[PDB]
Write a protein that binds this ligand. Structure first.
Ligand SMILES: OC[C@H]1O[C@@H](O[C@H]2[C@H](O)[C@@H](O)[C@H](O[C@H]3[C@H](O)[C@@H](O)[C@H](O[C@H]4[C@H](O)[C@@H](O)[C@H](O[C@H]5[C@H](O)[C@@H](O)[C@H](O)O[C@@H]5CO)O[C@@H]4CO)O[C@@H]3CO)O[C@@H]2CO)[C@H](O)[C@@H](O)[C@@H]1O
Lengths: 202, 202
């Protein structure tokens, strides 16, 4: 459904390679098109990684959900300065908008980043380029799949110690589509590439 | 007073420059002497940075509180492998210990690290080398002091956007001693070492 509301602007700045915004993105988007959303819409970070098509006075742009705006009511987006300028007059401070969450946004293959400080005792995993909301992230333990816990900062974490070796992870999106990612290394901070996608390229 | 209990062992491993343990230390101590403590002893990260003098079968060693052991009861320490080996037989798995928190531990001057991703809209500060528990961290805002919020991960964070310009931060410890740190820079990731100490060197 389309949400009708308003936008203000802010900036994460140029950022870093560790954690940008409440979603802890590996980078600020190169095009600087990102948005912080209300706490309900952030949904305990379940909205992290998703995209919104936002229409304002000047037209329509796409922004990555990057962050949480605690003071934004539902329907109020805190856009990047760049996204704001593309849609309206910067000095207006606030502009009327309408927006939708993009289904299957065009994107690269799924990637995985292990959190700094992770080990066999405790680890966080971040799922990059899923495109849509992720419902479950599980690590193989023999015949079973052990569920990781969704944090409110864009990672999924181990409830209990895991093995001292290669990791197989299954990620299931909100539409029930799953990818299985084998051979993942306990390599904190590194973005590990895969060949896997939730949906074909168009 | 003195706590009597038990120790097990675990490892943070080699570590990184971003966040080590739940206290998010800038580094695993060079001497690998650290400990994860029970949730009540962790006290919402208030124990972060403090030291324990731990007595076991082989003698006494000092460990830095670096981490939280959710599964530990009060009196149960999860020591680094190195600290464990210093106190007892590694393969025993569990050793009897007694311990106390060190008052005014010998150490360097106070340092401040601004969290990666910080800006004027939102920032986190980490206070390093206070030695004892910190009770308050405030940022100067004219004639007022704005209170930062203690997170459970070793930082203190802004409740609201702050002014621009040089930061002046006041840190007050559990004994009511305050240090004032002027000229601090919005420099995410950098350890900013200051001239201040809560107590003289001995
Ligand atoms: O068994 C425990 C286990 O702990 C390990 O240590 C972990 C700890 O478990 C994790 O919880 C902890 O997680 C923190 C991340 O490291 C940290 O980067 C992340 O930072 C967030 C912050 O939480 C969030 O509030 C902040 O929000 C702001 C946005 O950034 C701004 O842009 C916006 O304007 O305002 C919002 C606030 O309104 O975002 C930052 C990220 O950018 O917080 C996580 C905790 O909540 O990490 C520890 C280290 O990995 C320990 O290592 C294990 O040994 C131990 O077993």
């Amino acid at each position: 459904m389309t949400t009708h509301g308003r936008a203000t602007h802010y900036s994460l700045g140029q950022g870093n390679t560790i954690a940008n915004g409440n979603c802890s993105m590996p980078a600020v988007p190169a095009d600087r098109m990102y948005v912080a959303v209300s706490s309900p819409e952030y949904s305990g970070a379940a909205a992290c990684g998703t995209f919104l098509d936002v229409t304002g006075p000047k037209g329509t742009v796409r922004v990555q959900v990057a962050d949480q705006c605690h003071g934004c009511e539902v329907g109020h987006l805190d856009l990047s300065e760049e996204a704001f300028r593309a849609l309206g007059d910067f000095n207006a401070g606030i502009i009327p908008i309408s927006y939708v969450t993009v289904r299957d946004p065009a994107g690269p293959t799924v990637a995985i980043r292990v959190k700094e400080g992770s080990s066999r005792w405790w680890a966080g995993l971040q799922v990059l380029n899923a495109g849509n909301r992720i419902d479950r992230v599980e690590i193989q333990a023999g015949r079973q799949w052990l569920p990781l816990t969704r944090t409110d900062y864009g990672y999924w974490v181990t409830p209990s110690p895991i093995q001292d070796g290669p990791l197989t992870v299954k990620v299931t999106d909100q539409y029930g589509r799953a990818v299985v990612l084998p051979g993942l290394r306990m390599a904190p901070g590194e973005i590990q590439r895969t060949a896997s996608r939730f949906y074909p390229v168009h």
